[PDB]
Design a protein around this ligand. Structure first.
Ligand SMILES: [Mg+2]
Ligand SMILES: [Mg+2]
Ligand SMILES: [Mg+2]
Ligand SMILES: [Mg+2]
Ligand SMILES: [Mg+2]
Ligand SMILES: [Mg+2]
Lengths: 87, 25, 97, 217, 129, 121, 206, 81, 96
RNA sequence: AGGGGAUCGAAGAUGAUCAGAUACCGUCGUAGUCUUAACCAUAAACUAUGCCGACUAGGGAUCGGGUGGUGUUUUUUUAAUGACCCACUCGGCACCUUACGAGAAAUCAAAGUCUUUGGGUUCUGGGGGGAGUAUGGUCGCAAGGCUGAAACUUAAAGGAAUU
């Protein structure tokens, strides 16, 4: 957080699960970060610029990491129609 | 001694006590 | 502590089943708790089948079978090597062989 | 001397990481205690329990010794190592290694208004190990660390200077008490407060930015 | 039987937060549940919530943003005086800075900080953080 | 009681690993090779190491032995798994589909020479 | 985002249909249900190859994002994927783990088989469950060739495909290899296929 | 699944669900207009009629009570609603 | 509901339940029955005086072998006879 | 208290074993075992897990009811009702996997939704013994049931798991 005169006094600011907004802890050794390479015209990976999602250890431990990543990628246009909001 | 033989010895003892209390009354 | 989830028997929903008697010693056993084995023997043997085959009328008639259901208490079954005490993880297996 | 074998070690040795907060931020696993020594040089340690554990054998009891070690500077880092060994000195030395490999950050906050530097915990937190539950409550300035001497030493080595502590269970089980207290201060960054609701652009780990100097041929 | 429909609703929300789900169904959707959710919605602890109107008592689907740690009720609804509000906030809330004790008051259902600004007090409904 | 220990076996495997072209199928010259390609601190251990080496080579000639990867049998494996079975096994032999999988191709809009066939119930 | 060239071409669908990659298992788990398309009588469920191809291209866009190709790990304990994972290893960087995994390869930094990679791709979450469990300790993302019954435990990107047919396993690895070559300078024009057909990714007999 | 649309489930999902367990509960039963063989009179019949409904012409049976839906008497003609 | 009633109007039930369950406590049982005033050598006091009746050699409990050198005292305010320890090396010759 | 009393069989008798054996083993055998009309009110009466209500994970099987197959059996020209098969659904006895979560652990889909402690409600426990004893009351024909101490005594008793 920040003190009275601004000046954020906090060791670090933790990442968040892009699926469930949980805080990824320093001990969360099942949590992963997925980087997807953005693709230009005529199909090149553009080495250096990525679309990134963070999945906490809990989501992958519960098996919904694939479905959550399907939703986040579809929301960002990385996937077209594989994920469905209704079931 | 299992509890039930302790129980059996106490039950027989109790009706020795209320038998000797029968004479006293 | 508790040894088996199915306490020692097969009784969940009853409260009382029926007593059966052991074949070897005649101990009263709840019918679901009793170790039950089916006894299917030939009427004669494995070696005397031929002996009866050429010494009987009605050639290759039936060779009949003897049928019996044996009920054992836990101690008699163990002493007769019918159930053969198992390990803590291997006793959860319910397969026949 | 130290020759690194992990990617994190070979990249910390090259000076590409100058603070332990990056490892905490990207949840990178720590496998070499030299990484902690390079990033946190001022890491004071105090052995806190020496008890003999015995294993019965045909020819008498084979006695080993279990050492509980807590490392940590007074600026938001602690580690907890438990190690058993034949020798008392060997258990202490290897317990120091495991305690350094278990270094975690704690979140420090204010009991009331945010005047000055943080002096307490941001929220209440509880950790459980075995039957022992340790509960840490924020305290005002000047209250001190209101804790048992073992819990107090772990919190002094945490940098927190004002806390209220509640405990339950067989607190005389020293290893479980300290482990429960270690879980509670670990959970302090696990809690999500409103001042952490703002979204962040998800920075890429240093293991890919400076990936040229990892796993050399 | 169903003694507190509010306790049933908040228990459903807690189990949905723990499992990481972003939605939860609530039955049977009382006015107190609507009023309690509006305080949650006002302070950002939940997102949208919609009310399915069946002609029985209604159903609610709440959109969860993952920012909520716990939301319980305090049954029975104890009588709370102005001096007793701070005691309740000390016991139920993790920190003094955030979290809210929800009260039912003749001025309306509100959190504990809004109860201080209007200088009103009443019965306690629950808490949220 | 003639089971060779790890000292004999690991030295024999390490010898074949880096000296397969130099070696032969004769213990009489294998034992001479051992002194001048390895350091053995006794003649009895050399004969054991060279004897199991010849037994290893006799097995290597008729089929490979797992755990030993010398030079010659390695490049034989790249020349063998480089084989691709002509042009077949996925090229069209004349593509049979059922009704349900034909609907995939319809739902995707793609036009292929599909042939709907009847399956047994 | 992706142009029209990033779609399931008729020839790509020709290989998938001819390799029986659309034949799913007869027992679908709840997590693999979004890949079920009008479950066929005789019990077999049919996989949506369009959903498969979208997942396979997305998987490639993660594989062709690690700067160093050597620390991409591809794992196949089963014999059917053993040659496919080795050919995938040759064409790309892709240090392979084919056969036994040797527990302690992602942890236990002192073993000979120790690897500390950025990404693991396993052919089977069931047959390579040790590697997936190992990956869960050191923050390794996983792509698994998943049927409709295989578990999705710690699997970030599941590719819905048949896991029994050797043609299906070799093709998916071959298609994954082609795309990661396509999203780089090795295979500059995407419309043109390779000069070598897919059957060198297939497990041969005897 | 952790993300789904509770307000717009698929119509197949609600068809499989129990009548009380849908988003809004409702009867899966209906009413029928039955053509008795004898004449052309219309008697409205409930689907789960649970009684031997009668017209004024064929005064024996127009449907047969069962455990569920009533069984129309094997010679009649019916239309829904 | 974790046992106990939680009704806002259940104060009587909770107060009677605590009242009855407090009788399982040793100090509450001892105080409320007044055993110190009734069944005790002292009359609920810290100290009591009395006349020495005899000198006793008490053999200590195992695993200790010794003689404890106690005395028999008959209290003045009761007349109860109790045993008392002589707590120092020697000091039994002082008692008489 | 009547009836009935084949079988087995507290008591008892007897033959063995044994140092002894008034035990196990063997052979008899009264009460009992069955029933009618009354008593008793206790069991490791157990799931050692109160009841009602809500939610939290996956699967297959099974019992009862229901719904739908242009399904099989009655493959006899477009072939009743039951039986079976497939897909659902409600309710029930259970089980398997995993451990989200809990636990001291054994283990547990409840023993979860508990120091982030409150859905409603009943009953019970407060170290081990003395002791479910003594006394009083009440019920019972009796056996006994329910209720139920104190003096005194003690540093452990106990639970689960490891070698
Ligand atoms: Mg036992
Ligand atoms: Mg019973
Ligand atoms: Mg009882
Ligand atoms: Mg009981
Ligand atoms: Mg049932
Ligand atoms: Mg007691």
């Amino acid at each position: 957080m920040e003190n009275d005169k601004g000046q954020l006094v906090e060791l670090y600011v933790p990442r968040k699960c892009s699926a469930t907004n949980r805080i990824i802890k320093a001990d969360d050794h099942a949590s992963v970060q997925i980087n997807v390479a953005k693709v230009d015209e005529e199909g090149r990976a553009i080495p250096g610029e990525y679309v990134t999602y963070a999945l906490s250890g809990y989501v992958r431990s519960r098996g919904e990491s694939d479905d959550s990543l399907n939703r986040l990628a579809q929301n960002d246009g990385l996937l077209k129609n594989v994920w469905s909001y209704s079931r | 001694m299992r509890a039930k033989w302790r129980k059996k010895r106490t039950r027989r003892l109790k009706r020795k006590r209320r038998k000797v209390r029968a004479r006293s009354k | 502590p508790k040894k088996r989830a199915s306490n020692g028997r097969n009784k969940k929903g009853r409260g009382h089943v029926k007593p059966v008697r052991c074949v070897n010693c005649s101990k009263s056993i709840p019918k679901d708790k009793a170790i039950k084995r089916m006894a299917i023997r030939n009427i004669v043997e494995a070696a005397a089948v031929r002996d009866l085959s050429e010494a009987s009328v009605y050639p290759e008639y039936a060779l009949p079978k003897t049928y019996n259901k044996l009920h054992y208490c836990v101690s008699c079954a163990i002493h007769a090597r019918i159930v053969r005490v198992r390990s803590r993880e291997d006793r959860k297996n319910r397969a026949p062989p | 001397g130290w020759v690194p074998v992990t990617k994190l070690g070979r990249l910390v040795k090259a000076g590409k990481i100058t603070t332990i907060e990056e490892i905490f931020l990207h949840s990178l696993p720590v496998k070499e205690f030299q990484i902690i020594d390079t990033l946190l040089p001022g890491l004071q340690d105090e052995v806190m329990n020496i008890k003999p554990v015995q294993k019965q054998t045909r020819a008498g009891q084979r006695t080993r010794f279990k050492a509980v070690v807590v490392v940590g500077d007074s600026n938001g880092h602690v580690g907890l190592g438990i190690k058993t060994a034949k020798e008392v000195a060997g258990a202490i030395r290897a317990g120091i290694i495991i305690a350094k490999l278990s270094v975690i950050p704690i979140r420090r906050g204010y009991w009331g208004t945010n005047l000055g530097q943080p002096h307490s915990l941001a929220t209440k937190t509880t950790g459980k190990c075995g039957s022992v539950t340790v509960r840490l409550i924020p305290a005002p300035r000047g209250s001190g660390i209101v804790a048992s001497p073992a819990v107090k030493k772990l919190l002094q080595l945490a940098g927190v200077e004002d806390v209220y502590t509640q405990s339950n269970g067989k607190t005389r089980t020293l290893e479980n008490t300290l482990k429960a207290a270690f879980v509670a201060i670990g959970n302090t960054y696990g809690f999500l407060t409103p001042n952490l609701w703002a979204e962040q652009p998800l920075p890429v780990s240093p293991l890919d930015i400076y990936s040229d100097e990892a796993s050399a041929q | 039987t169903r003694s507190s429909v509010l306790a049933d609703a908040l228990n459903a929300i807690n189990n949905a937060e723990k499992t990481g789900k972003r939605q939860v169904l609530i039955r049977p959707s009382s006015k107190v549940i609507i009023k309690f959710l509006q305080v949650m919605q006002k302070h950002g602890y939940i997102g949208e919530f919609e009310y399915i109107d069946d002609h029985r008592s209604g159903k609610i689907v709440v959109q969860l943003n993952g920012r909520l740690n716990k939301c319980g009720v305090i049954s029975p609804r104890f009588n709370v005086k102005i001096g007793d509000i701070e005691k309740w906030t000390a016991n139920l809330l993790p920190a003094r800075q955030f979290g809210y004790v929800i009260l039912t008051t003749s001025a309306g259902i509100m959190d504990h900080e809004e109860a201080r600004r209007k200088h009103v007090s009443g019965k306690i409904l629950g808490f949220v953080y | 009681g003639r089971v060779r220990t790890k000292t004999v076996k690991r030295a024999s495997k390490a010898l074949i690993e880096r000296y397969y072209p130099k070696l032969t199928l004769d213990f009489q010259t294998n034992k001479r090779l051992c002194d001048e390609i390895a350091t053995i601190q006794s003649k009895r251990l050399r004969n054991k190491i060279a004897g199991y080496t010849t037994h290893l080579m006799k097995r290597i000639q008729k089929g490979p032995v797992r755990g030993i990867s010398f030079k010659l049998q390695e490049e034989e494996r790249e020349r063998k798994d480089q084989y691709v079975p002509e042009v077949s096994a996925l090229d069209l032999s004349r593509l049979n589909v059922d009704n349900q999988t034909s609907d995939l191709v319809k739902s995707l809009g793609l036009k292929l020479p599909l042939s709907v066939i009847n399956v047994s119930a | 985002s992706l142009p029209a060239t990033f779609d399931l071409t008729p020839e790509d669908a020709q290989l998938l249909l001819a390799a029986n990659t659309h034949l799913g298992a007869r027992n679908v788990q709840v997590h693999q249900e979004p890949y079920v398309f009008n479950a066929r009588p005789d019990g077999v469920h049919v996989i949506n190859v369009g959903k498969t191809w979208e997942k396979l291209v997305l998987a490639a866009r993660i594989i062709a994002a690690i700067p160093n190709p050597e620390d991409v790990v591809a794992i196949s304990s089963r014999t059917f994927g053993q040659r496919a994972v080795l050919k995938f290893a040759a064409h790309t960087g892709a240090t392979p783990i084919a056969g036994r995994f040797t527990p302690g390869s992602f942890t236990n930094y002192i073993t000979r088989s120790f690897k500390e990679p950025r990404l693991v791709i396993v052919t089977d979450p069931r047959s390579d469950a040790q590697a997936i469990k190992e990956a869960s300790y050191v923050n390794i993302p996983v792509i698994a060739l998943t049927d409709l019954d295989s578990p999705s435990e710690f699997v970030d990107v599941a590719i819905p495909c048949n896991n029994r047919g050797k043609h299906s396993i070799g093709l998916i690895w071959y298609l994954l290899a082609r795309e990661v070559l396509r999203l780089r300078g090795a295979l500059v024009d995407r419309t043109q296929p390779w000069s070598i057909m897919p059957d060198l990714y297939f497990y041969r007999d005897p | 699944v952790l993300v789904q649309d509770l307000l717009h489930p698929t119509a197949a999902s609600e068809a499989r669900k129990h009548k009380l367990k849908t988003l809004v509960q409702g009867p899966r039963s209906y009413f029928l207009d039955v053509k008795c063989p004898g004449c052309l009179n219309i008697t409205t019949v409930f689907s789960h009629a649970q009684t031997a409904v009668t017209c004024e012409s064929c005064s024996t049976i127009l449907c047969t009570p069962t455990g569920g839906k009533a069984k129309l008497s094997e010679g009649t003609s019916f239309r829904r609603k | 509901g974790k046992g106990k009633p939680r009704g806002l109007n259940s104060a009587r039930k909770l107060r009677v339940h605590r009242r009855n369950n407090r009788w399982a406590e040793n100090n509450y049982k001892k105080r409320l029955l007044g055993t110190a005033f009734k069944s005790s050598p002292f009359g609920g006091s810290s100290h009591a005086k009395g006349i020495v009746l005899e000198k006793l050699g008490i053999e200590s409990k195992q695993p200790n072998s010794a003689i404890r050198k106690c005395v028999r005292v008959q209290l003045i305010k009761n007349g109860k006879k109790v045993t008392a320890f002589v707590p120092n090396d020697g000091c039994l010759n002082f008692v008489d």
